Short mmCIF file of N, CA, C and O and ligand atoms in Angstrom, two decimals:
data_model
loop_
_atom_site.label_atom_id
_atom_site.label_comp_id
_atom_site.label_asym_id
_atom_site.label_seq_id
_atom_site.Cartn_x
_atom_site.Cartn_y
_atom_site.Cartn_z
N UNK A 184 -20.66 -47.15 6.94
CA UNK A 184 -21.73 -46.38 6.48
C UNK A 184 -21.66 -46.74 4.34
O UNK A 184 -20.43 -46.95 4.17
N UNK A 185 -22.58 -46.54 4.11
CA UNK A 185 -22.87 -47.04 3.10
C UNK A 185 -22.12 -45.65 2.30
O UNK A 185 -22.15 -44.39 2.26
N UNK A 186 -21.43 -46.45 0.94
CA UNK A 186 -20.64 -44.88 0.50
C UNK A 186 -21.21 -43.92 -0.74
O UNK A 186 -20.55 -43.24 -0.86
N UNK A 187 -22.18 -44.24 -0.30
CA UNK A 187 -23.05 -43.03 -1.38
C UNK A 187 -24.24 -41.93 -0.49
O UNK A 187 -24.97 -41.54 -1.57
N UNK A 188 -24.11 -41.95 0.52
CA UNK A 188 -24.64 -41.22 1.35
C UNK A 188 -23.63 -40.37 1.95
O UNK A 188 -24.03 -39.83 3.42
N UNK A 189 -22.77 -39.72 1.58
CA UNK A 189 -21.63 -38.97 2.63
C UNK A 189 -21.55 -37.80 2.38
O UNK A 189 -20.74 -37.13 2.47
N UNK A 190 -22.85 -37.31 1.10
CA UNK A 190 -22.17 -35.96 0.61
C UNK A 190 -21.76 -35.16 -0.45
O UNK A 190 -21.86 -34.54 -1.45
N UNK A 191 -20.52 -36.32 -1.17
CA UNK A 191 -20.20 -36.17 -2.41
C UNK A 191 -19.97 -37.65 -3.05
O UNK A 191 -20.65 -38.44 -2.57
N UNK A 192 -19.11 -37.08 -4.01
CA UNK A 192 -19.42 -38.73 -5.00
C UNK A 192 -18.41 -39.53 -4.83
O UNK A 192 -18.66 -40.75 -4.74
N UNK A 193 -17.27 -39.10 -3.75
CA UNK A 193 -15.97 -39.91 -3.37
C UNK A 193 -16.17 -40.25 -1.49
O UNK A 193 -15.72 -40.51 -1.15
N UNK A 194 -17.37 -39.03 -1.18
CA UNK A 194 -16.70 -39.37 0.38
C UNK A 194 -15.82 -38.24 0.74
O UNK A 194 -14.86 -38.57 1.73
N UNK A 195 -15.09 -37.44 0.26
CA UNK A 195 -13.82 -37.11 0.36
C UNK A 195 -13.94 -35.93 1.26
O UNK A 195 -12.96 -36.17 2.38
N UNK A 196 -15.01 -35.05 1.44
CA UNK A 196 -15.50 -34.13 1.98
C UNK A 196 -16.64 -34.42 2.81
O UNK A 196 -17.64 -34.78 2.39
N UNK A 197 -16.70 -34.40 4.30
CA UNK A 197 -18.14 -35.17 4.71
C UNK A 197 -19.05 -33.51 5.21
O UNK A 197 -20.29 -33.11 5.88
N UNK A 198 -18.74 -32.20 4.49
CA UNK A 198 -19.87 -31.29 4.44
C UNK A 198 -20.85 -30.94 4.38
O UNK A 198 -21.91 -29.93 4.60
N UNK A 199 -21.47 -32.03 3.34
CA UNK A 199 -22.59 -31.70 2.52
C UNK A 199 -23.42 -32.18 3.79
O UNK A 199 -24.96 -32.40 3.60
N UNK A 200 -23.05 -32.64 4.52
CA UNK A 200 -23.59 -33.52 6.05
C UNK A 200 -23.88 -33.08 6.89
O UNK A 200 -25.12 -33.28 8.07
N UNK A 201 -24.27 -31.25 7.23
CA UNK A 201 -24.04 -30.79 8.00
C UNK A 201 -25.77 -30.36 8.32
O UNK A 201 -26.03 -30.08 9.82
N UNK A 202 -26.54 -30.54 7.36
CA UNK A 202 -27.92 -30.13 7.65
C UNK A 202 -28.77 -31.54 8.54
O UNK A 202 -29.80 -31.30 8.66
N UNK A 203 -28.33 -32.82 7.99
CA UNK A 203 -28.70 -33.73 8.73
C UNK A 203 -28.00 -34.32 9.95
O UNK A 203 -28.83 -34.80 10.81
N UNK A 204 -26.93 -33.61 10.68
CA UNK A 204 -26.03 -33.53 11.66
C UNK A 204 -26.04 -32.49 12.24
O UNK A 204 -25.15 -32.30 13.15
N UNK A 205 -26.24 -31.19 12.68
CA UNK A 205 -26.42 -30.09 13.27
C UNK A 205 -26.76 -30.33 14.81
O UNK A 205 -27.92 -30.93 14.63
N UNK A 206 -26.19 -30.12 15.65
CA UNK A 206 -25.95 -30.49 17.24
C UNK A 206 -27.86 -29.82 17.69
O UNK A 206 -28.35 -30.40 18.29
N UNK A 207 -27.45 -28.22 16.98
CA UNK A 207 -29.22 -26.86 17.59
C UNK A 207 -29.38 -26.21 16.38
O UNK A 207 -28.68 -25.58 16.33
N UNK A 208 -30.12 -27.08 15.86
CA UNK A 208 -30.28 -26.53 15.03
C UNK A 208 -31.74 -25.33 14.44
O UNK A 208 -31.87 -24.65 14.28
N UNK A 209 -32.34 -24.42 16.01
CA UNK A 209 -32.81 -23.54 16.05
C UNK A 209 -31.89 -22.58 16.72
O UNK A 209 -31.98 -21.61 17.44
N UNK A 210 -30.25 -22.92 17.04
CA UNK A 210 -29.19 -21.72 17.06
C UNK A 210 -28.83 -20.83 15.78
O UNK A 210 -28.23 -21.95 14.96
N UNK A 211 -28.82 -19.99 15.37
CA UNK A 211 -28.43 -20.07 13.43
C UNK A 211 -26.85 -19.93 13.81
O UNK A 211 -26.39 -18.80 14.78
N UNK A 212 -25.90 -20.56 12.86
CA UNK A 212 -24.60 -20.32 12.32
C UNK A 212 -24.06 -18.86 12.35
O UNK A 212 -25.06 -18.39 11.25
N UNK A 213 -23.49 -18.49 13.06
CA UNK A 213 -22.80 -16.61 13.16
C UNK A 213 -22.68 -16.59 11.28
O UNK A 213 -22.27 -16.81 10.58
N UNK A 214 -23.35 -15.50 10.30
CA UNK A 214 -23.46 -14.80 9.36
C UNK A 214 -23.85 -13.52 9.12
O UNK A 214 -24.56 -12.79 9.25
N UNK A 215 -22.40 -12.78 9.02
CA UNK A 215 -22.54 -11.75 8.42
C UNK A 215 -22.12 -11.30 6.99
O UNK A 215 -21.16 -11.60 6.48
N UNK A 216 -23.47 -11.06 6.51
CA UNK A 216 -23.59 -11.00 5.25
C UNK A 216 -24.48 -9.58 4.71
O UNK A 216 -24.58 -8.55 4.55
N UNK A 217 -25.56 -9.91 5.62
CA UNK A 217 -26.65 -8.98 5.85
C UNK A 217 -25.88 -7.24 6.82
O UNK A 217 -26.47 -6.39 5.93
N UNK A 218 -25.07 -7.95 7.67
CA UNK A 218 -24.11 -6.44 8.08
C UNK A 218 -23.26 -5.54 7.13
O UNK A 218 -22.92 -4.43 7.12
N UNK A 219 -22.86 -6.73 5.82
CA UNK A 219 -22.19 -5.82 4.71
C UNK A 219 -22.73 -5.22 4.11
O UNK A 219 -22.52 -4.34 3.16
N UNK A 220 -24.31 -5.43 3.68
CA UNK A 220 -25.15 -4.56 2.28
C UNK A 220 -25.76 -3.79 3.43
O UNK A 220 -26.31 -2.94 2.99
N UNK A 221 -25.44 -3.49 4.42
CA UNK A 221 -25.90 -2.50 5.46
C UNK A 221 -25.68 -1.59 4.96
O UNK A 221 -26.13 0.02 6.34
N UNK A 222 -24.19 -1.48 5.00
CA UNK A 222 -22.93 -0.43 5.22
C UNK A 222 -22.80 0.03 4.28
O UNK A 222 -21.79 0.69 4.60
N UNK A 223 -23.00 -0.65 3.29
CA UNK A 223 -22.75 -0.14 1.75
C UNK A 223 -21.00 -0.29 1.37
O UNK A 223 -20.12 0.46 1.40
N UNK A 224 -20.78 -1.61 2.13
CA UNK A 224 -19.25 -1.98 1.60
C UNK A 224 -19.38 -2.24 0.16
O UNK A 224 -20.09 -3.08 -0.14
N UNK A 225 -18.19 -1.52 -0.81
CA UNK A 225 -17.79 -1.54 -1.81
C UNK A 225 -17.03 -3.32 -2.59
O UNK A 225 -16.97 -3.45 -1.57
N UNK A 226 -16.32 -3.63 -3.14
CA UNK A 226 -15.74 -4.74 -3.45
C UNK A 226 -14.27 -4.44 -2.93
O UNK A 226 -13.27 -4.91 -2.20
N UNK A 227 -13.91 -2.88 -2.73
CA UNK A 227 -12.47 -2.16 -1.95
C UNK A 227 -12.68 -2.14 -0.55
O UNK A 227 -11.59 -2.45 0.11
N UNK A 228 -13.63 -2.19 0.31
CA UNK A 228 -13.54 -2.45 1.50
C UNK A 228 -13.10 -3.99 2.26
O UNK A 228 -12.49 -3.56 3.14
N UNK A 229 -13.20 -5.35 1.33
CA UNK A 229 -13.12 -6.38 1.81
C UNK A 229 -11.55 -6.32 2.04
O UNK A 229 -11.00 -7.25 2.76
N UNK A 230 -10.64 -5.95 0.64
CA UNK A 230 -9.56 -5.72 0.42
C UNK A 230 -8.59 -5.01 1.62
O UNK A 230 -7.62 -5.46 2.37
N UNK A 231 -9.41 -4.12 1.83
CA UNK A 231 -8.90 -2.77 2.65
C UNK A 231 -9.06 -2.90 4.30
O UNK A 231 -7.79 -2.93 4.95
N UNK A 232 -10.06 -3.85 4.05
CA UNK A 232 -10.22 -3.98 5.63
C UNK A 232 -9.33 -5.46 5.93
O UNK A 232 -8.30 -6.33 6.83
N UNK A 233 -8.96 -6.16 4.74
CA UNK A 233 -7.90 -7.49 5.01
C UNK A 233 -6.46 -6.82 4.47
O UNK A 233 -5.22 -7.47 5.71
N UNK A 234 -6.04 -5.73 4.44
CA UNK A 234 -4.63 -5.39 4.43
C UNK A 234 -3.82 -4.77 5.87
O UNK A 234 -3.32 -4.75 6.17
N UNK A 235 -5.60 -3.74 6.69
CA UNK A 235 -5.22 -3.80 8.11
C UNK A 235 -5.22 -4.57 9.17
O UNK A 235 -4.92 -4.55 10.35
N UNK A 236 -5.43 -6.10 8.42
CA UNK A 236 -5.21 -7.17 9.33
C UNK A 236 -3.41 -7.81 9.34
O UNK A 236 -3.33 -7.68 10.41
N UNK A 237 -3.35 -7.44 8.30
CA UNK A 237 -1.76 -8.12 8.27
C UNK A 237 -0.92 -7.16 8.57
O UNK A 237 0.03 -6.98 9.40
N UNK A 238 -1.18 -5.94 8.36
CA UNK A 238 -0.37 -4.75 8.86
C UNK A 238 -0.31 -4.10 10.69
O UNK A 238 0.25 -4.01 11.33
N UNK A 239 -1.88 -4.99 10.98
CA UNK A 239 -2.04 -4.99 12.29
C UNK A 239 -0.85 -5.60 12.72
O UNK A 239 -0.64 -5.87 14.13
N UNK A 240 -0.31 -7.39 12.19
CA UNK A 240 0.23 -7.84 12.97
C UNK A 240 1.76 -7.81 12.60
O UNK A 240 2.43 -8.43 13.32
N UNK A 241 2.49 -6.59 12.11
CA UNK A 241 3.50 -6.23 11.43
C UNK A 241 4.31 -7.06 10.03
O UNK A 241 5.31 -7.56 10.24
N UNK A 242 3.38 -6.92 9.48
CA UNK A 242 3.64 -7.53 7.69
C UNK A 242 3.91 -6.18 7.02
O UNK A 242 2.84 -5.27 7.40
N UNK A 243 4.32 -6.04 5.51
CA UNK A 243 4.23 -4.50 5.22
C UNK A 243 2.75 -4.65 4.29
O UNK A 243 1.94 -5.62 4.29
N UNK A 244 2.34 -3.40 4.04
CA UNK A 244 1.52 -3.43 2.49
C UNK A 244 1.56 -3.99 2.07
O UNK A 244 2.69 -4.83 1.20
N UNK A 245 0.24 -3.90 1.04
CA UNK A 245 0.42 -3.66 -0.78
C UNK A 245 1.24 -2.82 -1.17
O UNK A 245 1.42 -1.95 -1.02
N UNK A 246 1.81 -4.12 -2.45
CA UNK A 246 3.06 -2.92 -3.02
C UNK A 246 2.69 -1.65 -3.98
O UNK A 246 3.36 -1.32 -4.64
N UNK A 247 1.62 -1.46 -4.14
CA UNK A 247 0.62 -0.09 -4.42
C UNK A 247 0.75 -0.16 -6.57
O UNK A 247 0.13 0.50 -6.93
N UNK A 248 1.80 -1.25 -6.65
CA UNK A 248 1.36 -1.55 -7.98
C UNK A 248 -0.12 -2.72 -7.96
O UNK A 248 -0.41 -3.01 -9.09
N UNK A 249 -0.79 -3.27 -6.65
CA UNK A 249 -1.39 -4.09 -6.32
C UNK A 249 -2.80 -3.38 -6.32
O UNK A 249 -3.80 -4.28 -7.11
N UNK A 250 -2.83 -2.26 -6.74
CA UNK A 250 -4.08 -1.75 -6.77
C UNK A 250 -4.82 -1.37 -8.10
O UNK A 250 -6.26 -1.32 -8.29
N UNK A 251 -3.66 -1.15 -9.28
CA UNK A 251 -3.92 -0.98 -10.26
C UNK A 251 -4.68 -1.97 -11.02
O UNK A 251 -5.33 -1.91 -11.78
N UNK B 138 18.35 -5.07 -18.59
CA UNK B 138 17.37 -5.09 -18.11
C UNK B 138 16.22 -4.52 -18.93
O UNK B 138 15.96 -3.78 -19.70
N UNK B 139 15.34 -5.85 -19.14
CA UNK B 139 14.04 -5.92 -19.93
C UNK B 139 12.67 -4.72 -19.02
O UNK B 139 12.30 -5.32 -18.40
N UNK B 140 13.11 -3.34 -18.86
CA UNK B 140 12.19 -2.63 -18.09
C UNK B 140 10.75 -2.83 -18.83
O UNK B 140 10.96 -2.63 -19.89
N UNK B 141 9.99 -3.18 -18.25
CA UNK B 141 8.23 -2.82 -18.55
C UNK B 141 7.46 -1.95 -17.55
O UNK B 141 8.06 -1.53 -16.56
N UNK B 142 6.63 -1.60 -17.62
CA UNK B 142 5.82 -0.60 -17.43
C UNK B 142 5.02 -1.53 -16.33
O UNK B 142 4.63 -0.44 -15.04
N UNK B 143 4.83 -2.41 -15.97
CA UNK B 143 4.57 -3.00 -14.62
C UNK B 143 4.81 -3.75 -14.07
O UNK B 143 4.51 -4.87 -13.52
N UNK B 144 5.79 -3.12 -13.45
CA UNK B 144 7.17 -3.44 -12.65
C UNK B 144 7.15 -3.17 -11.67
O UNK B 144 7.20 -1.91 -11.08
N UNK B 145 6.93 -4.22 -10.31
CA UNK B 145 6.68 -3.43 -9.02
C UNK B 145 8.07 -2.35 -8.23
O UNK B 145 9.02 -2.95 -9.37
N UNK B 146 7.98 -1.55 -7.58
CA UNK B 146 8.56 -0.51 -7.70
C UNK B 146 9.97 -1.28 -7.03
O UNK B 146 9.73 -2.53 -6.36
N UNK B 147 11.49 -0.78 -7.11
CA UNK B 147 12.33 -1.52 -7.22
C UNK B 147 12.80 -2.37 -8.17
O UNK B 147 13.81 -3.20 -8.65
N UNK B 148 12.22 -2.50 -9.35
CA UNK B 148 12.73 -2.57 -10.52
C UNK B 148 12.18 -1.71 -11.57
O UNK B 148 12.83 -2.62 -13.22
N UNK B 149 11.89 -0.80 -11.45
CA UNK B 149 11.10 0.53 -12.31
C UNK B 149 12.77 0.95 -12.16
O UNK B 149 13.69 1.22 -11.45
N UNK B 150 13.20 2.03 -13.58
CA UNK B 150 14.36 2.33 -14.22
C UNK B 150 14.56 3.30 -12.78
O UNK B 150 13.38 4.50 -13.11
N UNK B 151 15.42 3.94 -12.51
CA UNK B 151 15.42 5.09 -11.56
C UNK B 151 17.00 6.04 -12.47
O UNK B 151 18.05 4.99 -13.33
N UNK B 152 16.41 7.02 -12.56
CA UNK B 152 17.93 7.89 -12.74
C UNK B 152 18.81 8.79 -11.71
O UNK B 152 17.71 9.25 -10.78
N UNK B 153 20.00 8.83 -11.83
CA UNK B 153 21.27 8.65 -10.94
C UNK B 153 21.82 9.77 -11.68
O UNK B 153 22.17 9.37 -12.68
N UNK B 154 22.16 10.70 -10.92
CA UNK B 154 23.44 11.66 -10.83
C UNK B 154 24.73 11.87 -10.18
O UNK B 154 23.95 12.06 -8.57
N UNK B 155 25.90 11.57 -9.87
CA UNK B 155 26.32 11.72 -8.98
C UNK B 155 27.78 13.06 -8.99
O UNK B 155 28.49 13.16 -9.78
N UNK B 156 27.38 14.24 -8.54
CA UNK B 156 27.96 15.39 -8.24
C UNK B 156 29.31 14.98 -7.79
O UNK B 156 28.79 14.77 -6.43
N UNK B 157 30.44 15.50 -8.19
CA UNK B 157 31.93 15.12 -7.29
C UNK B 157 32.46 16.64 -7.39
O UNK B 157 32.93 16.55 -8.63
N UNK B 158 32.59 16.61 -5.97
CA UNK B 158 33.08 18.20 -5.73
C UNK B 158 34.60 17.70 -5.73
O UNK B 158 35.22 17.13 -4.71
N UNK B 159 35.41 18.33 -6.63
CA UNK B 159 37.38 18.26 -6.83
C UNK B 159 37.83 19.11 -6.64
O UNK B 159 37.97 19.57 -7.45
N UNK B 160 38.70 19.63 -5.42
CA UNK B 160 39.32 21.16 -5.62
C UNK B 160 40.50 20.68 -5.75
O UNK B 160 40.78 19.97 -6.35
N UNK B 161 41.40 21.68 -5.51
CA UNK B 161 42.49 21.77 -6.16
C UNK B 161 43.43 23.06 -5.77
O UNK B 161 44.19 23.65 -4.70
N UNK B 162 43.11 24.41 -6.70
CA UNK B 162 43.67 25.62 -6.02
C UNK B 162 43.43 26.81 -7.73
O UNK B 162 43.62 26.42 -8.64
N UNK B 163 43.56 28.01 -7.20
CA UNK B 163 43.22 29.19 -7.75
C UNK B 163 42.80 30.42 -6.47
O UNK B 163 43.27 30.38 -5.92
N UNK B 164 42.48 31.72 -7.89
CA UNK B 164 42.79 32.46 -6.91
C UNK B 164 41.57 33.15 -6.31
O UNK B 164 40.71 33.80 -6.01
N UNK B 165 40.04 32.30 -7.38
CA UNK B 165 38.72 32.59 -7.02
C UNK B 165 37.91 32.26 -7.61
O UNK B 165 38.46 31.63 -9.17
N UNK B 166 36.67 31.93 -8.03
CA UNK B 166 35.63 31.23 -8.51
C UNK B 166 34.48 31.89 -8.00
O UNK B 166 33.49 32.40 -7.17
N UNK B 167 33.21 30.12 -8.79
CA UNK B 167 31.62 30.89 -7.90
C UNK B 167 32.21 30.69 -6.39
O UNK B 167 32.48 30.45 -4.94
N UNK B 168 30.75 31.21 -6.03
CA UNK B 168 30.30 31.60 -4.74
C UNK B 168 29.12 31.90 -4.55
O UNK B 168 27.80 31.88 -5.63
N UNK B 169 28.28 32.17 -3.33
CA UNK B 169 26.82 32.65 -3.02
C UNK B 169 26.61 33.20 -3.45
O UNK B 169 27.19 34.36 -4.18
N UNK B 170 25.05 33.68 -3.34
CA UNK B 170 24.29 34.72 -3.98
C UNK B 170 24.34 35.68 -2.98
O UNK B 170 23.38 35.48 -2.12
N UNK B 171 24.97 36.99 -3.06
CA UNK B 171 24.75 38.00 -1.97
C UNK B 171 22.85 38.87 -2.35
O UNK B 171 22.49 38.76 -3.77
N UNK B 172 22.51 39.38 -1.46
CA UNK B 172 20.95 39.89 -1.07
C UNK B 172 21.27 41.31 -1.42
O UNK B 172 22.67 42.04 -1.12
N UNK B 173 20.39 42.44 -1.30
CA UNK B 173 19.93 43.46 -1.61
C UNK B 173 18.52 44.04 -1.09
O UNK B 173 18.01 43.11 -0.13
N UNK B 174 18.51 45.34 -1.47
CA UNK B 174 17.16 46.35 -1.38
C UNK B 174 17.01 47.10 -1.81
O UNK B 174 17.17 47.32 -3.07
N UNK B 175 16.20 48.46 -1.46
CA UNK B 175 15.85 49.52 -2.07
C UNK B 175 16.39 50.71 -1.64
O UNK B 175 15.63 51.02 -0.79
N UNK B 176 17.54 51.04 -2.22
CA UNK B 176 18.08 52.24 -1.71
C UNK B 176 17.10 53.27 -1.82
O UNK B 176 16.12 53.13 -2.12
N UNK B 177 17.29 54.05 -0.82
CA UNK B 177 16.94 55.23 -1.26
C UNK B 177 17.70 56.98 -1.06
O UNK B 177 18.44 56.41 -1.93
N UNK B 178 17.04 57.92 -1.03
CA UNK B 178 17.67 59.10 -1.25
C UNK B 178 17.07 60.31 -0.58
O UNK B 178 16.23 59.81 -0.39
N UNK B 179 18.12 61.30 0.05
CA UNK B 179 18.16 62.62 0.98
C UNK B 179 17.51 61.76 2.56
O UNK B 179 16.47 62.65 2.85
N UNK B 180 18.19 60.85 2.68
CA UNK B 180 18.11 60.94 3.86
C UNK B 180 19.88 59.93 4.60
O UNK B 180 20.28 59.06 3.58
N UNK B 181 20.08 60.40 5.82
CA UNK B 181 21.42 59.91 5.86
C UNK B 181 21.07 58.19 5.84
O UNK B 181 20.21 57.87 6.69
N UNK B 182 22.09 57.80 5.37
CA UNK B 182 22.03 56.30 5.27
C UNK B 182 23.31 55.81 5.06
O UNK B 182 24.13 56.08 5.37
N UNK B 183 23.16 54.59 5.63
CA UNK B 183 25.19 53.50 5.70
C UNK B 183 24.29 52.58 4.78
O UNK B 183 23.58 51.74 4.45
N UNK B 184 25.31 52.64 3.82
CA UNK B 184 25.14 51.75 2.26
C UNK B 184 26.15 51.11 1.85
O UNK B 184 28.07 51.06 2.42
N UNK B 185 26.41 49.73 1.38
CA UNK B 185 27.07 49.41 0.19
C UNK B 185 27.00 48.68 -0.81
O UNK B 185 25.70 48.83 -1.15
N UNK B 186 27.44 49.36 -2.11
CA UNK B 186 27.20 49.33 -2.92
C UNK B 186 28.39 48.46 -3.67
O UNK B 186 29.22 48.97 -3.79
C1 NAG C 451 1.31 1.31 5.30
O1 NAG C 451 0.00 2.04 4.24
C2 NAG C 451 -0.90 3.20 5.10
C3 NAG C 451 -2.11 4.02 4.19
O2 NAG C 451 -2.18 3.21 3.33
C4 NAG C 451 -0.07 4.37 6.12
O3 NAG C 451 -0.57 4.58 7.16
C5 NAG C 451 0.77 3.14 6.42
O4 NAG C 451 2.06 3.75 7.26
C6 NAG C 451 1.81 2.17 5.81
N1 NAG C 451 2.60 1.38 6.41
C7 NAG C 451 3.66 1.47 6.42
C8 NAG C 451 5.08 0.39 7.96
O5 NAG C 451 4.12 2.48 6.12
#
Protein backbone atom coordinates (compact mmCIF):
# COMPACT_ATOMS: atom_id res chain seq x y z
CA UNK A 1 0.00 0.00 0.00
CA UNK A 2 1.27 3.53 -0.70
CA UNK A 3 2.36 5.30 2.46
CA UNK A 4 0.26 8.45 1.95
CA UNK A 5 -3.16 6.75 1.70
CA UNK A 6 -3.44 5.19 5.16
CA UNK A 7 -5.49 7.69 7.16
CA UNK A 8 -2.87 9.78 8.98
CA UNK A 9 0.65 11.14 8.56
CA UNK A 10 2.57 7.98 9.50
CA UNK A 11 0.15 5.08 9.07
CA UNK A 12 0.20 4.38 12.80
CA UNK A 13 -3.56 3.84 13.04
CA UNK A 14 -5.77 2.78 10.14
CA UNK A 15 -8.84 4.13 11.94
CA UNK A 16 -9.60 6.86 9.39
CA UNK A 17 -10.11 4.25 6.65
CA UNK A 18 -13.43 3.09 8.08
CA UNK A 19 -15.68 5.09 5.74
CA UNK A 20 -14.00 3.46 2.72
CA UNK A 21 -13.75 -0.06 4.18
CA UNK A 22 -17.08 -0.48 6.04
CA UNK A 23 -18.53 -3.97 5.39
CA UNK A 24 -22.25 -3.09 5.51
CA UNK A 25 -22.78 0.64 5.12
CA UNK A 26 -26.58 0.33 5.24
CA UNK A 27 -26.49 -0.67 8.93
CA UNK A 28 -25.81 2.10 11.48
CA UNK A 29 -23.04 1.28 13.93
CA UNK A 30 -24.68 1.63 17.34
CA UNK A 31 -24.44 5.13 18.81
CA UNK A 32 -26.13 6.13 22.07
CA UNK A 33 -25.74 9.91 22.17
CA UNK A 34 -29.32 10.86 21.37
CA UNK A 35 -30.65 8.69 24.20
CA UNK A 36 -28.44 10.68 26.61
CA UNK A 37 -29.87 14.08 25.62
CA UNK A 38 -33.40 12.69 25.65
CA UNK A 39 -33.21 11.78 29.36
CA UNK A 40 -31.51 15.04 30.52
CA UNK A 41 -28.29 13.45 31.75
CA UNK A 42 -26.07 16.05 33.36
CA UNK A 43 -22.31 16.10 33.72
CA UNK A 44 -22.63 14.10 36.94
CA UNK A 45 -24.65 11.15 35.64
CA UNK A 46 -21.78 9.92 33.45
CA UNK A 47 -19.52 9.42 36.46
CA UNK A 48 -22.22 8.15 38.81
CA UNK A 49 -23.10 5.40 36.37
CA UNK A 50 -19.37 4.80 36.08
CA UNK A 51 -19.04 4.47 39.85
CA UNK A 52 -21.95 2.03 39.87
CA UNK A 53 -20.09 -0.12 37.34
CA UNK A 54 -17.08 -0.48 39.61
CA UNK A 55 -19.07 -1.08 42.78
CA UNK A 56 -20.92 -3.76 40.79
CA UNK A 57 -17.74 -5.83 40.46
CA UNK A 58 -16.55 -5.49 44.06
CA UNK A 59 -14.35 -2.40 44.04
CA UNK A 60 -14.51 0.55 46.46
CA UNK A 61 -16.48 3.76 46.01
CA UNK A 62 -14.96 7.08 45.14
CA UNK A 63 -13.19 8.73 48.03
CA UNK A 64 -15.78 11.55 48.60
CA UNK A 65 -13.02 14.09 48.23
CA UNK A 66 -13.30 13.07 44.58
CA UNK A 67 -16.55 15.01 44.12
CA UNK A 68 -15.59 18.48 45.29
CA UNK B 1 2.48 15.96 59.72
CA UNK B 2 1.96 18.57 57.11
CA UNK B 3 -1.80 18.67 57.30
CA UNK B 4 -3.67 20.20 54.38
CA UNK B 5 -7.41 20.66 53.95
CA UNK B 6 -7.44 18.86 50.60
CA UNK B 7 -6.22 15.56 52.06
CA UNK B 8 -8.07 12.30 51.54
CA UNK B 9 -9.64 10.84 54.64
CA UNK B 10 -7.11 8.82 56.53
CA UNK B 11 -4.72 11.69 56.11
CA UNK B 12 -6.80 14.31 57.89
CA UNK B 13 -6.20 15.05 61.56
CA UNK B 14 -8.16 13.16 64.18
CA UNK B 15 -8.31 14.21 67.80
CA UNK B 16 -8.09 11.43 70.36
CA UNK B 17 -8.92 11.23 74.07
CA UNK B 18 -8.05 8.11 76.06
CA UNK B 19 -9.88 7.71 79.35
CA UNK B 20 -8.20 5.33 81.75
CA UNK B 21 -10.04 4.35 84.90
CA UNK B 22 -7.66 3.26 87.65
CA UNK B 23 -9.18 1.89 90.86
CA UNK B 24 -7.39 1.76 94.21
CA UNK B 25 -9.34 1.99 97.47
CA UNK B 26 -11.59 4.37 99.40
CA UNK B 27 -14.81 4.76 101.41
CA UNK B 28 -16.97 6.14 98.60
CA UNK B 29 -17.11 8.52 95.63
CA UNK B 30 -18.91 9.28 92.37
CA UNK B 31 -21.83 7.13 91.21
CA UNK B 32 -24.98 7.00 89.08
CA UNK B 33 -27.70 9.66 89.10
CA UNK B 34 -30.86 8.86 91.08
CA UNK B 35 -34.35 9.47 89.70
CA UNK B 36 -37.39 11.12 91.30
CA UNK B 37 -40.98 12.27 90.81
CA UNK B 38 -43.52 14.74 92.21
CA UNK B 39 -44.42 14.10 95.85
CA UNK B 40 -48.10 14.44 96.73
CA UNK B 41 -50.16 15.35 99.80
CA UNK B 42 -53.26 14.14 101.64
CA UNK B 43 -52.88 10.54 100.48
CA UNK B 44 -51.42 7.46 102.14
CA UNK B 45 -48.29 7.04 100.05
CA UNK B 46 -45.07 5.06 99.92
CA UNK B 47 -42.23 7.58 99.93
CA UNK B 48 -38.45 7.78 99.69
CA UNK B 49 -36.68 11.06 100.54
C1 LIG C 1 -20.96 3.32 47.99
O1 LIG C 1 -21.82 4.49 48.05
C2 LIG C 1 -23.23 4.21 48.04
C3 LIG C 1 -23.93 5.54 48.06
O2 LIG C 1 -23.21 6.52 47.33
C4 LIG C 1 -23.58 3.33 49.24
O3 LIG C 1 -24.97 3.01 49.19
C5 LIG C 1 -22.75 2.06 49.21
O4 LIG C 1 -23.03 1.25 50.35
C6 LIG C 1 -21.26 2.39 49.17
N1 LIG C 1 -20.46 1.18 49.11
C7 LIG C 1 -20.01 0.56 50.20
C8 LIG C 1 -19.20 -0.68 49.96
O5 LIG C 1 -20.24 0.97 51.33
